[PDB]
Design a protein around this ligand. Structure first.
Ligand SMILES: Nc1ncnc2c1ncn2[C@@H]1O[C@H](CSCC[C@H](N)C(=O)O)[C@@H](O)[C@H]1O
Ligand SMILES: [Zn+2]
Ligand SMILES: [Zn+2]
Ligand SMILES: [Zn+2]
Lengths: 104, 104, 78, 430
C-alpha cells in the first residue's frame, strides 16, 4: 500500500482530491486511530477497502460500506472549514471507488 | 527433562581405518572429472592452443595420474612408518621422489 | 585451476594408499608433483600429436607417451 | 541395598532387541546397502575340547572388531559363532538393579568385569525426529523427570521410555566407569555400553550422558563425583536466558546480554535468583537495568504490549522513565496510534487509585509520569477520546488533593489538552 504506484491513479479522481478520497475510505471503515495528517494510515485504509485480504460472503470488496456515509454533512463541514464546494466531488469519488473507470 | 544423550565422537583413526577399507575395496575415480579436465586444458594451453582433447584421452590421463599418486602415497607411507611416525610430511614425499629417481 | 584438485579428493587419494594421518602442508606438495607429472605427459602427447599432423589429441598419443615413460597403461586400445 | 530387578522390570515392556518405527530407519551407511560386506580375514580357531570358535577375540587382530563392526555369519571368513558376535548373541554382562539414595533405580555389576568388555546393549524403539518431538512433548506434559532418549544418528533417535532394556536405568556420572559406543551389525546400527576400566562386583555402572537439552532447563547432578559440574548438560544455562518475558524485557531496553549479565554477576557469586518464572517480578533486576531512549516503532509496540500485560509497579516505573528519556516524535506518534494514553490510564489507576504502595512513592511515580504526558505532541482531542484519561486525571487529583504539585500539574495538563479541537468524523447512516 505504501508503494510508488497508487490505487486512485486508475480512477477519474483528480490528484488534489486523493487525500479526500482516502479520508472517505478511512472513515467508511470505522477506523478511529486515524489522524488526517497520517497519509500512511490513509493509504492502508483505502488499500484494505478496495483490495481487502479477506472479503465477506458474496462481496468482492469493502466498497459497499461507502453507502452508509453521510456525504452531505461532510460537504457542509468542508465548505465551513476550507470554503470548498465539493458536494458533487464526493459523489464522483464514491462512484469511482465502487467501480474504477466505468464505461460512461 | 526432555533432553537427548549424545553418542559422542569416534576416536581419531577409527573412521580413518573404515574409510581406508572402503576406498581400498572400491575402484571409482577419486578426482572430480571437470576440474581435472580444466587443469589438463590449462597445462596444454601453454604449448599450442586450438588443441581438442578427446574424452578417452582425458580419462586415460586421469587413470595414469591417480595410479601415480596412489603409488607415491604408498611409498611415502613406507617412509613415514620407517621414521616411527604415522603422519606423512612433505620431507617424506621429497625423499620418496629422490630415491625413485624422479627428483635429481 | 590447480586449486580444483580439492582437499577431500587428495585426502581420498592418500587414503587409498593406506595413509592414516595427513599433514596440513602436504597438499601443496601433492599439487606440485601432480602438476609436474601431468606437464611431462601432456608435453609428450602434444608433440606426438604435432608430428601426426592432427589438431586433436587422441587417447593413443597419451598411451604412447605413458608407455614411452615406462608407465604402460592397459585398457585404452594399447 | 535390596535387589529391585523384577520390580524395575515390571515398570516397562522388556525388549530382547531394538524395535523399528520403519525399516528405513537405523540402517547402516544411511541405508546404502554395502553388498560387499566387510569380511574379516580371520581364520576360524575351533577349540576341539569345547567346540567353541575362538576367532575374532579380544587379543586377535580382527579388523572388524577394531573398527567397531560385528562379524555376520555366512559372510565372514571367521565362520559362525566367532568371538565378535556380542550384540547378536546377546551375551550381556551380569547386572542387578538397586535403589539409590537420590537417583532412583541404578545398575550394578553382579561380577568383576574386564577392561573394554561389552556390558549391555542399550535397547529401545528407533524413531524419527518428528516422532521424537511428539513423544518429548507428551512426556514433558506428563511431568517425567527422567531422560529416556539417545541419538542413534542425525535425525534418528532411540526411545527407552515404554520399551527397552536394563540399560535405561544407568545413571550419569561425571567421572564414569562405563561408556556408550556405536557399532555396526550387518546393515544396522547398534548402541552398546562397554566397560571403560576394570569394575569390581557391587559397583554401580554409570556412563556420561552428554545431554543435549534441546532448550530444556538444567537438571542438577547428584552423582557425588568430585569433578562434578553440578548440572546435567554441556550447555551453560542457569537462569542467564530470561528473567522477564521477551516483549517486556525488550520494552525495558534489556536484551539477551543484559539478562545474562545480572544472573552471571549474582547467581555465580552466592546470591539467590529464582528459577525461570514470569509470574513473580524481581524488582532488583528492573531497578538495576540500564535505560536508553527508544527510536524504533517495533520497540514502541513492545512497550505498549508490556503496558497492557505487566502489572508490576517497578517495571512500569522504569518503562515510564525510559519514555522520559525517549524524545523521538515518530515513536510518540506510534504510541498515540497504539493508544498509549489508554494504557497509561490503567497504569495510573492501579498505582494511585488502588493502593499497594506508599503515598510518597506514588507521588514520585505520578510526578515521573505527568512529564511525558505534558511533553508529547498532541493536535486533537480525538487522541484523548480513545482513552478519556482526563477522567482518570480528575479522579487522581481529587483523591490526592493534599499533594498540590500533582494537582497543579494536572491543571496545566487539562488546560493544555482542552485547547485542542476534535478531529471531524463523518457521520454514518442509521
Ligand atoms: N547422578 C544423578 N543425580 C540425580 N539424577 C540423576 C543422576 N543421574 C541420572 N539421573 C536422572 O535419571 C535420569 C535417567 S533414566 C535413569 C533411571 C531412572 N532415573 C530411574 O531411577 O528409574 C536422568 O534424566 C536424570 O534425571
Ligand atoms: Zn574377524
Ligand atoms: Zn568374526
Ligand atoms: Zn555430576
Amino acid at each position: 500500500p505504501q508503494g510508488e504506484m497508487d490505487l486512485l491513479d486508475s480512477t477519474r479522481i483528480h490528484p488534489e482530491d486523493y487525500s479526500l478520497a482516502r479520508k472517505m475510505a478511512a472513515d467508511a471503515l470505522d477506523i478511529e486511530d486515524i489522524d488526517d495528517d497520517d497519509e500512511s494510515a490513509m493509504r492502508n485504509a483505502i488499500y484494505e477497502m478496495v483490495f481487502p485480504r479477506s472479503p465477506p460472503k458474496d462481496e468482492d470488496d469493502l466498497t459497499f460500506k461507502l453507502d452508509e456515509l453521510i456525504l452531505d454533512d461532510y460537504a457542509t463541514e468542508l465548505e465551513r472549514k476550507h470554503q470548498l464546494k465539493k458536494r458533487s466531488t464526493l459523489q464522483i469519488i464514491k462512484e469511482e471507488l465502487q467501480s474504477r473507470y466505468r464505461e460512461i | 527433562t526432555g533432553g537427548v544423550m549424545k553418542p559422542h565422537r569416534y576416536r581419531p583413526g577409527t573412521v580413518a581405518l573404515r574409510e581406508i577399507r572402503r576406498y581400498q575395496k572400491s575402484t571409482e575415480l577419486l578426482i572430480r572429472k571437470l576440474p581435472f579436465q580444466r587443469l589438463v586444458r590449462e597445462i596444454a594451453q601453454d604449448f599450442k592452443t586450438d588443441l581438442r582433447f578427446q574424452s578417452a584421452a582425458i580419462g586415460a590421463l586421469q587413470e595414469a595420474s591417480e595410479a601415480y599418486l596412489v603409488g607415491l602415497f604408498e611409498d611415502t607411507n613406507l617412509c613415514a612408518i620407517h621414521a616411527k611416525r604415522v603422519t606423512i610430511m612433505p620431507k617424506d614425499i621429497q625423499l620418496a621422489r629422490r630415491i625413485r629417481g624422479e627428483r635429481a | 585451476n590447480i586449486q580444483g584438485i580439492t582437499k577431500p579428493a587428495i585426502r581420498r587419494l592418500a587414503r587409498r594408499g593406506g595413509v592414516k594421518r595427513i599433514s596440513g602442508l602436504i597438499y601443496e606438495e601433492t599439487r606440485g608433483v601432480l602438476k609436474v607429472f601431468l606437464e611431462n605427459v601432456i608435453r609428450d602427447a602434444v608433440t606426438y600429436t604435432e608430428h601426426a599432423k592432427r589438431k586433436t589429441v587422441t587417447a593413443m598419443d597419451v598411451v604412447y607417451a605413458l608407455k614411452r615413460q615406462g608407465r604402460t597403461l592397459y585398457g585404452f586400445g594399447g | 541395598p535390596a535387589d529391585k530387578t523384577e520390580e524395575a522390570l515390571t515398570t516397562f515392556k522388556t525388549l530382547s532387541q531394538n524395535s523399528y518405527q520403519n525399516k528405513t530407519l537405523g540402517n547402516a551407511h544411511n541405508g546404502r546397502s554395502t553388498a560387499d560386506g566387510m569380511s574379516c580375514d580371520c581364520e576360524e580357531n575351533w577349540d576341539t575340547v569345547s567346540g567353541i570358535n575362538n576367532a575374532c577375540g579380544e587379543y586377535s587382530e580382527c579388523i572388524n572388531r577394531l573398527t567397531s563392526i560385528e562379524c555376520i555369519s555366512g559372510t565372514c571368513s571367521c565362520g559362525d559363532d566367532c568371538q565378535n558376535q556380542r550384540f547378536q548373541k546377546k551375551q550381556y554382562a551380569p547386572i542387578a538393579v538397586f535403589e539409590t539414595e537420590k537417583k532412583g533405580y541404578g545398575v550394578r555389576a553382579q561380577a568383576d568385569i574386564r577392561q573394554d568388555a561389552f556390558i549391555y546393549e542399550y535397547l529401545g524403539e528407533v524413531i524419527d525426529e518428528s516422532t521424537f518431538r511428539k513423544r518429548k512433548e507428551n512426556y514433558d506434559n506428563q511431568g517425567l523427570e527422567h531422560f529416556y532418549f539417545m541419538m542413534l544418528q542425525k535425525g534418528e533417535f532411540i526411545d527407552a521410555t515404554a520399551k527397552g532394556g536394563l540399560g535405561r536405568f544407568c545413571n550419569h556420572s561425571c567421572r564414569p566407569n562405563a561408556y556408550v559406543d556405536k557399532w555396526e551389525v550387518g546393515n544396522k546400527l547398534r548402541m552398546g555400553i562397554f566397560a571403560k576400566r576394570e569394575i569390581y562386583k557391587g559397583e554401580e555402572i554409570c556412563f556420561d550422558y552428554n545431554v543435549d537439552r534441546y532448550g530444556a532447563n538444567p537438571q542438577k547432578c547428584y552423582c557425588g563425583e568430585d569433578n562434578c559440574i553440578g548440572f546435567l548438560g554441556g550447555r551453560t544455562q542457569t537462569d542467564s536466558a530470561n528473567i522477564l518475558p521477551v516483549p517486556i524485557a525488550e520494552a525495558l531496553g534489556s536484551t539477551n546480554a543484559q539478562e545474562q549479565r545480572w544472573v552471571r554477576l549474582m547467581k555465580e557469586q552466592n546470591k539467590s535468583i529464582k528459577a525461570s518464572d514470569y509470574s513473580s517480578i524481581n524488582e532488583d533486576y528492573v531497578n538495576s537495568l540500564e535505560m536508553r531512549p527508544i527510536a524504533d516503532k517495533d520497540e514502541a509496540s513492545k512497550v505498549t504490549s508490556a503496558l497492557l500485560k505487566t502489572q508490576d509497579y517497578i517495571i512500569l516505573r522504569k518503562l515510564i522513565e525510559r519514555v522520559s528519556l525517549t524524545k523521538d516524535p515518530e515513536v510518540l506518534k506510534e504510541i498515540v496510534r497504539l493508544r498509549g494514553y489508554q494504557c497509561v490510564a490503567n497504569i495510573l489507576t492501579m498505582i494511585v487509585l488502588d493502593q499497594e504502595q506508599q503515598q510518597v512513592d506514588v507521588e514520585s511515580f505520578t510526578l515521573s509520569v505527568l512529564d511525558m504526558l505534558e511533553s508529547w505532541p498532541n493536535s486533537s482531542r480525538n487522541r484523548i477520546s480513545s482513552s478519556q484519561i482526563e477522567s482518570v486525571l480528575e479522579s487522581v487529583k481529587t483523591k490526592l488533593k493534599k499533594i498540590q504539585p500533582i494537582g497543579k500539574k494536572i491543571n496545566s495538563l487539562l488546560n493544555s489538552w482542552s485547547k485542542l479541537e476534535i478531529s471531524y468524523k463523518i457521520p454514518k447512516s442509521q
